[PDB]
A paper describes a structure:
DHQase catalyzes the dehydration of 3-dehydroquinate to 3-dehydroshikimate. There are two types of DHQase: type I enzymes catalyze a Schiff base mechanism using a catalytic lysine residue; type II DHQase catalyze the dehydration reaction via an enolate intermediate. DHQase from Enterococcus faecalis is a type I enzyme.
The study also elucidated the structure of E. faecalis DHQase to a resolution of 2.2 Å. The efDHQase monomer has a (β/α)8-barrel scaffold. The majority of the molecule is well ordered and with clear density in the electron density map, with the exceptions of the first and last two residues at the N- and C-terminus, respectively, and a disordered portion (Ala228-Gln236) within the loop connecting the 8th β-strand and the 8th α-helix (β8-α8 loop). There are two monomers in the asymmetric unit of the crystal, forming a homodimer. On each monomer, there are a total of 94 atoms belonging to 24 residues that are involved in the formation of the dimer interface. The non-crystallographic symmetry (NCS) differences for most of the residues are well below 0.3 Å (as reported by COOT), indicating close conformational similarity between the two protomers. Moreover, these residues, and in particular Lys170, are positioned in nearly identically positions in these three homologous structures, despite the absence of bound ligand in the efDHQase structure. Such similarities strongly suggest that efDHQase catalyzes the dehydration reaction via a Schiff base mechanism whereby the terminal amine of efDHQase's Lys170 reversibly reacts with the carbonyl of the substrate. In the absence of bound ligand, the β8-α8 loop of efDHQase adopts the “open” conformation commonly seen in other DHQases, and becomes partially disordered.
Residue numbers in the entry:
A (entry chain A), B (entry chain B): 3 to 227, 237 to 251
Write the structure that this text describes.
Amino acid sequence: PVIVKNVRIGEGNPKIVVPIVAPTAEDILAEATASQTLDCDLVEWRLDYYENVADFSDVCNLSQQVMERLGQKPLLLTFRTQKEGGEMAFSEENYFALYHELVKKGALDLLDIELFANPLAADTLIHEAKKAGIKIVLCNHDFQKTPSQEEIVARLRQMQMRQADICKIAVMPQDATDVLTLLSATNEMYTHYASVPIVTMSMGQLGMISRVTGQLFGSALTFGSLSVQVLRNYLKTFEQ
Amino acid sequence: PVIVKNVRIGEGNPKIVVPIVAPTAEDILAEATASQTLDCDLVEWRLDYYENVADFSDVCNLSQQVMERLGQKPLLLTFRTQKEGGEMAFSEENYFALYHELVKKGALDLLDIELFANPLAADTLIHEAKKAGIKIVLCNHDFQKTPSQEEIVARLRQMQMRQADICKIAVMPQDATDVLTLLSATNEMYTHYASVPIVTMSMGQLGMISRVTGQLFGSALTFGSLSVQVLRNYLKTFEQ
């Protein structure tokens, strides 16, 4: 169980994550302040939405102001790359340079790193982040399709092998079978291979059940904009 | 799609069944009247709870009174046998004799017959009930375990082969894998073999999700005492 600011990720009910996707600084701070009265456990600031994300110092400073308003909720920072659903084109070099800077002079508790990004660069980044006390979330997103159950499991297993603190995968269902594929992949990974927390979801309207069944099948985080209030309520209903 | 009093079973969202399990006629009538303002689509009266179920004429008359109070919601009549989770010991002979009288002198829209009951007696009953315009629900309940995915499918296919209007199976999960097994069995039956509506569920707290996922995986009916209020709300949230 990964413990950050008293939030026990990988224990009890799935912890709730709200994303900030606002593009202006002013709205990003407002929504951070708003999280203080939202029924969630942590906050993900999505970097690839931020209009000034190419200014790495602006981002580091802004990250400080966001943290100050979070009422001691963990702050996850994520630059989702374009090939996995992200908002903007970004060179690999800028991808790793931004993260290295946040690690040095930014505020954050967890760092999102895509499994498929340049591993040599990513591994070096991982150790620099961990040294700073940042928890690592390795992750993969397929927004077009659902890989086979074995491939989802293999990807989750490769993240754990790369010393992820938390392994995450999101896949896009095209029918109800794909949702089962994701749910089963989640169950197999969790019961048989996982010794760190894992996070999975089947995206879209078809995969929505995957966002409230985390306790049953072994998914330790769920993301809420399903809204965060409905999410907590639904988690309690399906609580084991 | 089985259409009964305008309830289109097998289309759109899962239709909600509220059971009546009160033991006295007084409370059974009270609950039938109360269903008129409950957010449900039909009503199952569990005969095996009824203190006077052995008085077949009393049951026939009571069913008439129940019907008058249903605001034109379909009435499903069910005697669940002990071996399948029922409330009382009851001979095979009295089980068929009860249903036969109901077919002739009772009021009911759907009749619940268990797959494993004496099939020759059961088939003769089925044609008599259909002749009286009654829909047949062939069904199986395992309240202690979950059979293999293939067996669940085979039982559902056997129910359809015996000319069921609706095929139903409830199984008992012992872990998360068992719930998936049931959900997967549902999906496979629905997509590859079903030409009549099917109803599936994984019992208990573990399998609670299978009560709100009918539209996604192919289950046409869901039962709520989850309460009927919560159920409809939850069906709308996960609606496709």
